[PDB]
């Protein structure tokens, strides 16, 4: 099963999904037919194996299949790890999902487009989201250099090397690529083999995981004799699940109240291959024994799964400590952030979930929020991200920490 979760943030159509395609091969389908004329709409998913040509020279030594005879020669490249990606979308409005997605990341790669004006709305929006949540292991990537003047891509590298200054981004390297002709990708694999190291995770900890998809496997027409169970897609962060454990989902289904759903892990799968257990980094899918109605389209989106008989709060009202940006990096316009007024509706992005809520308390950096849909707060360390409907479309404006 994949070791780690690398996110591919960035503006729209810079080719995020395409870079994922040159690295893994996989497409995100682009589905719902709509995505097929549009673009990535759900978080895309894909995995890959990274081995290295010991017996030759780098970056090219950075392989993809147990095969070195591609550069230098044969000695079956040594396997370093198997990684997974999370393709977000790029569209100014899918902000609410990409946020959500970050909650699973262990690191990222910022795909800027080589042939469009560097700090483009969403590129920034993302970047600052990254420095805000905590994803500090970053690799910027200059994508569409296969369509530019050898001057242009260097001058952009300048504006980048200059943005990456005052900000937290010391030597966040910048590896120009060609996601279309898959050029230079191996030096990208060497970047991501250096800088996006695979974090240790104490297993002993409470089994806890975030959900961001869920499907009804069942084909149009499978008979009842073999109706395969409900299936929950998401990522583990702390602990580890095993086949045949007893589990619950929070907040779970609603009545207006919100109760937890129990079931047994029917099965465990990463990519297309089945495993008996599952550990952090990656996305998994969990076969369950619950009525697939319950998780068709992606119902339990923003829900979390933990140990059955476990101690987690299903809050309706929450104590956020908090801070603001001075600007709204996400509108083409940078208008200065108005301080929070109470009785205001704000999107509270907590974990994978995306919930809406109203402001009851307004202090210096501690506001109290009342929510439509409960949030199961698993820790005291619960990072959150706070947004406001500026001009019809929502916008990332500030953050903080959940408090219990």
């Amino acid at each position: 099963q994949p070791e780690v979760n690398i996110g591919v943030v960035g503006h729209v159509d810079h080719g995020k999904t395409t870079l994922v395609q040159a690295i893994t091969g996989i497409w995100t389908s682009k589905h719902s037919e709509e995505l097929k004329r549009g673009m990535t709409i759900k978080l895309g998913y894909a995995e890959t194996n990274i081995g290295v040509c010991e017996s030759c020279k780098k970056p090219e030594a950075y392989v993809t299949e147990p095969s070195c005879k591609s550069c230098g020669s044969d000695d079956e490249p040594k396997f370093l790890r198997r990684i997974s990606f999370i393709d977000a979308p790029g569209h100014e409005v899918l902000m609410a999902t990409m946020l959500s997605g970050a909650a699973l990341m262990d690191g990222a790669i910022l795909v800027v487009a080589a042939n469009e004006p560097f700090p483009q709305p969403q590129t920034r929006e993302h970047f600052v989201a990254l420095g805000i949540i905590g994803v500090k292991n970053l690799i910027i990537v200059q994508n569409k250099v296969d369509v530019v003047s050898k001057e242009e891509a260097l001058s952009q590298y300048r504006q980048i090397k200059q943005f990456t200054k005052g900000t937290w981004a010391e030597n966040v390297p910048i590896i120009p690529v060609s996601a279309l002709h898959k050029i230079n990708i191996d030096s990208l694999i060497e970047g991501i083999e250096e800088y996006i190291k695979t974090p240790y995770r104490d297993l002993s900890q409470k089994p806890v995981m975030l959900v961001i998809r869920s499907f009804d496997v069942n084909k149009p027409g499978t008979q009842f004799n073999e109706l395969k169970g409900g299936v929950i897609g998401g990522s583990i962060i702390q602990g580890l699940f095993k086949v045949d454990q007893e589990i619950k989902v929070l907040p779970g289904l609603r009545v207006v109240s919100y109760e937890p759903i129990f079931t047994k892990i029917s099965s465990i799968r990463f990519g297309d291959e089945e495993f008996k257990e599952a550990k952090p980094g990656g996305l998994v899918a969990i076969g369950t024994y619950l009525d697939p109605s319950l998780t068709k389209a992606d119902n339990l989106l923003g829900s979390i799964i933990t140990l059955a008989d476990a101690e987690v709060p299903v809050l309706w009202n929450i104590r956020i400590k908090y801070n603001l940006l001075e600007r709204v990096v996400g509108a083409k316009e940078m208008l200065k952030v108005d301080p929070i007024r109470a009785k205001e509706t704000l999107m509270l992005s907590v974990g994978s979930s995306t919930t809406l809520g109203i402001v009851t308390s307004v202090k210096k950096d501690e506001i109290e929020v009342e929510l439509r849909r409960p949030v199961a707060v698993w820790s005291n360390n619960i990072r959150t991200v706070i947004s406001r409907q500026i001009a019809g479309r929502w916008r990332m404006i500030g953050w903080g920490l959940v408090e219990i």
Partner: peptide
């Protein structure tokens, strides 16, 4: 640090059609 990069830019450019 530009050298590493400037290098990278070189090496891709020399892979075009």
């Amino acid at each position: 640090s530009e050298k590493e990069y400037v290098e990278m830019l070189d090496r891709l450019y020399s892979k075009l059609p």
